[PDB]
Amino acid sequence: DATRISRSDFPADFIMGTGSSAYQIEGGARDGGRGPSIWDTFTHRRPDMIRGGTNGDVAVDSYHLYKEDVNILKNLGLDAYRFSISWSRVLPGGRLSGGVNKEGINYYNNLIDGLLANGIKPFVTLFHWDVPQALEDEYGGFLSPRIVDDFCEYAELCFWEFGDRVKHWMTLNQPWTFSVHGYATGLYAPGRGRSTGNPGTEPYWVTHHLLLAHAAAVELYKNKFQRGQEGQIGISHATQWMEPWDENSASDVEAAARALDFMLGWFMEPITSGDYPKSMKKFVGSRLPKFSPEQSKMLKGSYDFVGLNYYTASYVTNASNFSYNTDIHVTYETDRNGVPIGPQSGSDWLLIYPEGIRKILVYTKKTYNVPLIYVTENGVDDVKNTNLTLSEARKDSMRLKYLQDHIFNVRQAMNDGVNVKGYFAWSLLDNFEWGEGYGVRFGIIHIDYNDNFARYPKDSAVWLMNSFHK
């Protein structure tokens, strides 16, 4: 029974925490010497692209309120906290010649020491879509392959400064989303894809550059730091369970496996065997870059653990110039015969399907043979309602049930022999939600935008504390 699930259902080394990302929570966008990211420029030059015409300038000010956030995490009582570093905060010109920003570095050391002073293990993510505008304007950010070198300098800087305290690193979080919405749909920064953009090619380049960035940085950590710092490095991928519309149509079973390949295979096959997946080569063909064999040699096996981000699920079936969206040759369906795959959440794109996480997990271990996994994101948003008062606003029953159901399923995947080491809820705080602006609330901690971002736990947080404290 899911409602009874608690810490003692898990092995003792199991890790529990929460998560944020720098641009969604920090604010202090032009403070302490930070330079502009592509999200800074996107939200300020294309306000029409954001619900409310808002931006992350202040966000929820974890830049100035990080001490409260740490006190929150100490009360919450979980093992670990996952956050990301703002590239253009530590290097405002993105590359070394641009300046090294001591104040930015001091911020993260203050963050990291606060966490450890309180027994909370930091899990740090080098990159979460916030590309320094300077690198974007000079050579097209991740379009160009120069990005690998700059990224590598940025990475080395973080390892040298923080690697004595941070022992768990991730190069990238959710690169899929950065590629697709950055360059295919043009909904996220830099906002490209109808030169003005091209959903047929750019996404594939960008992803190509992301993966070399990731593999270069892991070679760096592994050759220069790991022996002396003794940490571990890995990466974090967007996932979504893909169900065959018709369990029978062996052709649907195929539209589903293809939908995987194009989402998760696109990143996981490279770091597994040094190459993209067949289906992708087949359907993309010559628009899809190749790896030199030293590149493959570098990618193949570039990680100590993998993190999976899981929210939702879908039915897949087959489809009927060029674009990533169409290259997949599938159609997405939400119901079989009038029945949705699961109930809606506050967000119409998000259907609740706890069994999906069990599946995605088992699939991953089976298809790619990963020996160590973390779930690095999993959570749900609140129904929008500016009408509720706080005692109402905080009873977040759906989220609570969502957490218990997904955590129960993770536990099942383990029984199936998937070696999962921890689970992190998304997100710690309500925060900036990219194109959605401040309207969507994923926090286990509630935030009051009308009164300096006062923070208050929701019942999910009290429940996490009480059920998983240690």
Instruction: Give the footprint of its own copies on this chain (CB under 8 A).
Output: 6, 29-31, 33, 36, 41, 44-45, 47-48, 52-55, 57-58, 74-75, 77, 92-93, 95-102, 133-134, 137-138, 149, 153, 156, 160-161, 164, 224-229, 385-391, 394, 450-452, 454, 456-457, 462-463, 465-467, 469
Using the minimum distance from each CB to its own copies, give the nearer residue, 137 or 247: 137
How near is the Cβ of 244 to its own copies at its closest, in Å? Answer: 42
Instruction: Tell me which of Cl ion, its own copies, none is bound by residue 8, counting a contact when its beta carbon lies within the kind-specific cut-off of 5 to 8 angstroms.
Output: none
Q: Which two tokens stand for residue 282?
A: 């087949």
How near is the Cβ of 390 to its own copies at its closest, in Å? Answer: 4
Instruction: Tell me which of its own copies, Cl ion, none is bound by residue 140, counting a contact when its beta carbon lies within the kind-specific cut-off of 5 to 8 angstroms.
Output: none
| C-beta neighbour count of 254 within 10 angstroms | 17
How near is the Cβ of 300 to its own copies at its closest, in Å? Answer: 23
User: Is the Cβ–Cβ distance between 428 and 458 less than 8 Å?
Assistant: no
- Counting residues that bind Cl ion (by CB under 5 A) gives 5
80 strand-pairing partners:
17, 121
**Regarding beta strands 80-84 and 445-448, do their DSSP bridges make them parallel or antiparallel, or are they unpaired?**
unpaired
Using the minimum distance from each CB to its own copies, give the nearer residue, 10 or 353: 10
Please, what is the end-to-end C-alpha distance for the chain in angstroms?
22
Using the minimum distance from each CB to its own copies, give the nearer residue, 164 or 416: 164
How near is the Cβ of 284 to its own copies at its closest, in Å? Answer: 32
How near is the Cβ of 431 to Cl ion at its closest, in Å? Answer: 23
| C-beta neighbour count of 348 within 10 angstroms | 8
User: Is the Cβ–Cβ distance between 154 and 35 less than 8 Å?
Assistant: no
> What amino acid occupies position 140?
G
Cα within 13 Å of Cα(134), Cβ side: 17
Phi, psi of 377 (to 5 degrees): -145, 145
Using the minimum distance from each CB to its own copies, give the nearer residue, 224 or 421: 224
457 strand-pairing partners:
445
Check residue 388 for interaction with Cl ion (CB under 5 A). Answer: no
CA distances from 185 to 78, 198, 349 (A): 37, 10, 16
Question: What is the footprint of Cl ion within residues 50-109 (CB under 5 A)?
Answer: 95-97
Q: How far apart are CA 360 and CA 309, in angstroms?
A: 10
Using the minimum distance from each CB to its own copies, give the nearer residue, 359 or 458: 458
Using the minimum distance from each CB to Cl ion, give the nearer residue, 93 or 175: 93
How near is the Cβ of 400 to Cl ion at its closest, in Å? Answer: 19
Q: Which of 389, 415, 417, 451 binds Cl ion (CB under 5 A)?
A: 389
In the DSSP assignment, the letter for residue 79 is: S
Q: In the block, which residue shows the tokens 């940085």?
A: 217
Q: How far apart are CA 6 and CA 67, in angstroms?
A: 28
| Residue 259, burial from CB neighbour count under 10 angstroms (0-12, 13-18, 19+) | buried
Using the minimum distance from each CB to its own copies, give the nearer residue, 163 or 199: 163
Q: How far apart are CA 54 and CA 23, in angstroms?
A: 13
How near is the Cβ of 425 to Cl ion at its closest, in Å? Answer: 26
How near is the Cβ of 177 to its own copies at its closest, in Å? Answer: 23
**Regarding beta strands 335-336 and 330-333, do their DSSP bridges make them parallel or antiparallel, or are they unpaired?**
unpaired
Instruction: Tell me which of its own copies, Cl ion, none is bound by residue 30, counting a contact when its beta carbon lies within the kind-specific cut-off of 5 to 8 angstroms.
Output: its own copies
Which of 426, 388, 335 minimizes the C-alpha distance to 24? 426
Phi, psi of 185 (to 5 degrees): -75, -25
Instruction: Tell me which of its own copies, Cl ion, none is bound by residue 75, counting a contact when its beta carbon lies within the kind-specific cut-off of 5 to 8 angstroms.
Output: its own copies
Q: Which of 223, 292, 391, 415 binds Cl ion (CB under 5 A)?
A: 391
Using the minimum distance from each CB to Cl ion, give the nearer residue, 195 or 391: 391
Site of interaction with Cl ion (CB under 5 A): 95-97, 389, 391
